[PDB]
Scaffold this active site. Structure first.
Site, short mmCIF file in Angstrom:
data_model
loop_
_atom_site.label_atom_id
_atom_site.label_comp_id
_atom_site.label_asym_id
_atom_site.label_seq_id
_atom_site.Cartn_x
_atom_site.Cartn_y
_atom_site.Cartn_z
N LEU A 13 -17.90 22.07 16.29
CA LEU A 13 -18.21 22.34 17.69
C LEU A 13 -18.27 23.83 17.99
O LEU A 13 -18.75 24.23 19.05
CB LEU A 13 -17.18 21.69 18.61
CG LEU A 13 -17.12 20.16 18.60
CD1 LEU A 13 -16.00 19.66 19.51
CD2 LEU A 13 -18.46 19.60 19.04
N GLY A 14 -17.74 24.65 17.09
CA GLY A 14 -17.78 26.09 17.29
C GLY A 14 -16.82 26.84 16.39
O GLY A 14 -15.96 26.24 15.75
N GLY A 19 -10.07 30.79 14.44
CA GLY A 19 -10.07 29.36 14.21
C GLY A 19 -11.43 28.75 14.44
O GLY A 19 -12.33 29.41 14.94
N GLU A 20 -11.59 27.49 14.05
CA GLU A 20 -12.84 26.78 14.32
C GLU A 20 -12.52 25.40 14.87
O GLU A 20 -11.43 24.86 14.65
CB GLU A 20 -13.71 26.70 13.07
CG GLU A 20 -13.11 25.95 11.92
CD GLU A 20 -14.00 25.99 10.69
OE1 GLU A 20 -14.18 24.93 10.05
OE2 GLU A 20 -14.52 27.08 10.37
N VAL A 21 -13.46 24.84 15.62
CA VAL A 21 -13.21 23.60 16.33
C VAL A 21 -14.14 22.53 15.85
O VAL A 21 -15.36 22.75 15.78
CB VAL A 21 -13.36 23.77 17.86
CG1 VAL A 21 -13.18 22.42 18.57
CG2 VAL A 21 -12.36 24.81 18.39
N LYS A 36 -8.82 22.15 16.81
CA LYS A 36 -8.94 23.53 16.35
C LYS A 36 -8.09 23.73 15.10
O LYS A 36 -6.91 23.32 15.06
CB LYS A 36 -8.55 24.52 17.46
CG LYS A 36 -8.70 26.00 17.06
CD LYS A 36 -8.77 26.92 18.26
CE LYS A 36 -8.89 28.38 17.80
NZ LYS A 36 -9.11 29.29 18.97
N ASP A 141 -11.40 36.58 31.60
CA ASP A 141 -12.78 36.34 31.13
C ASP A 141 -13.42 35.10 31.76
O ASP A 141 -14.12 34.35 31.09
CB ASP A 141 -12.83 36.21 29.60
CG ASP A 141 -14.25 36.41 29.03
OD1 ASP A 141 -15.18 36.77 29.80
OD2 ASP A 141 -14.44 36.23 27.81
N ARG A 145 -19.91 30.48 30.84
CA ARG A 145 -19.85 30.34 29.38
C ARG A 145 -18.46 29.90 28.88
O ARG A 145 -18.34 29.40 27.78
CB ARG A 145 -20.25 31.65 28.69
CG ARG A 145 -19.26 32.78 28.88
CD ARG A 145 -19.71 34.08 28.22
NE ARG A 145 -18.81 35.16 28.62
CZ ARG A 145 -19.01 35.94 29.68
NH1 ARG A 145 -20.10 35.79 30.40
NH2 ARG A 145 -18.13 36.85 30.01
N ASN A 146 -17.42 30.13 29.68
CA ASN A 146 -16.05 29.80 29.26
C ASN A 146 -15.54 28.51 29.90
O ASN A 146 -14.36 28.18 29.80
CB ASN A 146 -15.10 30.95 29.56
CG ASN A 146 -15.03 31.93 28.43
OD1 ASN A 146 -15.12 31.54 27.25
ND2 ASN A 146 -14.85 33.23 28.75
N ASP A 159 -11.33 29.47 27.13
CA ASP A 159 -11.34 30.91 26.88
C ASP A 159 -11.76 31.10 25.44
O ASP A 159 -10.90 31.21 24.55
CB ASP A 159 -9.98 31.55 27.14
CG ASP A 159 -10.05 33.07 27.15
OD1 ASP A 159 -11.13 33.63 26.85
OD2 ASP A 159 -9.01 33.72 27.44
C1 LIG Z 1 -7.54 28.36 28.56
N1 LIG Z 1 -7.57 28.89 27.19
C2 LIG Z 1 -8.28 28.18 26.28
O1 LIG Z 1 -8.85 27.16 26.61
C3 LIG Z 1 -8.32 28.73 24.85
N2 LIG Z 1 -8.95 27.74 23.97
C4 LIG Z 1 -8.15 26.71 23.25
N3 LIG Z 1 -9.21 25.80 22.71
C5 LIG Z 1 -8.82 24.63 21.94
C6 LIG Z 1 -9.76 23.92 21.20
C7 LIG Z 1 -9.39 22.79 20.48
C8 LIG Z 1 -8.08 22.35 20.49
C9 LIG Z 1 -7.13 23.06 21.23
C10 LIG Z 1 -7.50 24.20 21.95
C11 LIG Z 1 -10.60 26.36 22.90
C12 LIG Z 1 -11.45 25.32 23.65
C13 LIG Z 1 -12.93 25.73 23.65
N4 LIG Z 1 -13.35 25.99 22.24
C14 LIG Z 1 -14.27 25.25 21.51
O2 LIG Z 1 -14.69 25.67 20.42
C15 LIG Z 1 -14.84 23.99 22.02
C16 LIG Z 1 -16.26 23.88 22.00
C17 LIG Z 1 -16.88 22.71 22.42
C18 LIG Z 1 -16.03 21.68 22.88
N5 LIG Z 1 -16.29 20.41 23.42
N6 LIG Z 1 -15.14 19.76 23.76
C19 LIG Z 1 -14.12 20.58 23.46
C20 LIG Z 1 -14.63 21.81 22.90
C21 LIG Z 1 -14.02 22.98 22.45
C22 LIG Z 1 -12.72 27.20 21.71
C23 LIG Z 1 -11.23 26.85 21.58
C24 LIG Z 1 -10.34 27.56 23.82
O3 LIG Z 1 -11.16 28.27 24.37
#
Ligand SMILES: CNC(=O)CN1CN(c2ccccc2)C2(CCN(C(=O)c3ccc4n[nH]cc4c3)CC2)C1=O
Length: 287
Positions: A13-14, A19-21, A36, A141, A145-146, A159
């Protein structure tokens, strides 16, 4: 607490800096989740950043913020687990819709979105931010996009960090400095580096602009990074030469006035998220 052997990895997913998801299937109490894990090139420093993110994420418990569903047990390779948001990031999502022409003429799944749905989207972001404010948690941020989109236009603030190539244009980079989303940043942030709930309100203002633009253009898109940074200087000097984002075509004048208040020179004159949420949920439905 969660056994890693219960995950079945399905697609990527990214990836971010530490890390990678992956999309995963679970058979136990098929559910889809986002997981992740460390990158293949994970270093000692990336693992440290990963563990700290786990601690940060443990704090966040709100319907409109990414939530930590689980972590892998100490024995297993590190992982974080969250909800799968099937419709991806909000910027890509809105870019694929246009504002409906006639109200309630379409079908579910249509590439169109109503003005009240835009309000609903923005109100959810406002609610998430209202929650972060009660934690004295500063995001730094906020942007479409976030944010992530689930079923039925549910929104969660994430984020991602600043490494997706797709959004490289949204960040100002100088060797040896923090990477800065200058087009979303309050003037005092650009000039003085200090980030507050009030500068998050400013960023919310720009995010709201994005939503009402259906993400069709970058903030200050016809201006260079240098010009955007100079604009912050014009806010400081307060001689009436600073410029603002223009009113989106989908945005009524009343909502735009609220948007403008998010960009007040004085931090204290910017509306709290409680006020922003109330306006989006209720007042904005006014004729
Ligand atoms: C508020 N702070 C955060 O959220 C920081 N964090 C923690 N976090 C996370 C990811 C997995 C497990 C636990 C935490 C992310 C979520 C968005 N990310 C993805 O790659 C992504 C992409 C398409 C997706 N579709 N459904 C879900 C998706 C997730 C980057 C990592 C992030 O920004």
């Amino acid at each position: 607490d969660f056994p890693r052997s219960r995950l079945r990895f399905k697609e990527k997913l990214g990836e971010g800096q530490f890390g990678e998801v992956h999309l995963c299937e679970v058979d136990s109490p098929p559910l889809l989740v986002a997981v992740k894990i460390l990158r293949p090139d994970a270093t000692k420093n990336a693992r440290n950043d990963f563990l700290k993110e786990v601690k940060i994420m443990s704090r966040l418990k709100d319907p409109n913020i990414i939530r930590l569903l689980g972590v892998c047990v100490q024995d297993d390779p590190l992982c974080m687990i969250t909800d799968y948001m099937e419709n991806g990031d909000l910027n890509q999502f809105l870019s694929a819709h246009q504002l409906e022409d006639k109200a309630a003429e379409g079908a579910p799944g249509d590439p169109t979105i109503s003005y009240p749905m835009l309000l609903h989207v923005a109100a959810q972001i406002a609610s998430g931010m209202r929650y972060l404010a009660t934690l004295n948690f500063v995001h730094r941020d906020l942007a479409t996009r976030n944010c992530l989109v689930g079923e039925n236009f549910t929104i969660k603030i994430a984020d991602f960090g600043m490494s997706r190539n797709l959004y490289a244009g949204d960040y100002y980079r100088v060797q040896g400095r923090a990477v800065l989303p200058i087009r979303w940043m309050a003037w005092e942030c650009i000039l003085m580096g200090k980030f507050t709930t009030a500068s998050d309100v400013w960023a919310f203002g720009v995010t709201l602009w994005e939503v009402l633009m259906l993400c069709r253009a970058q903030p200050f898109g016809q201006l260079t990074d240098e010009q955007v940074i100079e604009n912050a200087g014009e806010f400081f000097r307060d001689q009436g030469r600073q410029v603002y984002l223009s009113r989106p075509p989908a945005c009524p004048q009343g909502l735009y006035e609220l948007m403008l208040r998010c960009w007040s020179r004085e931090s204290e004159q910017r509306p709290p998220f409680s006020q922003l949420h109330r306006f989006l949920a209720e007042d904005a439905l006014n004729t």
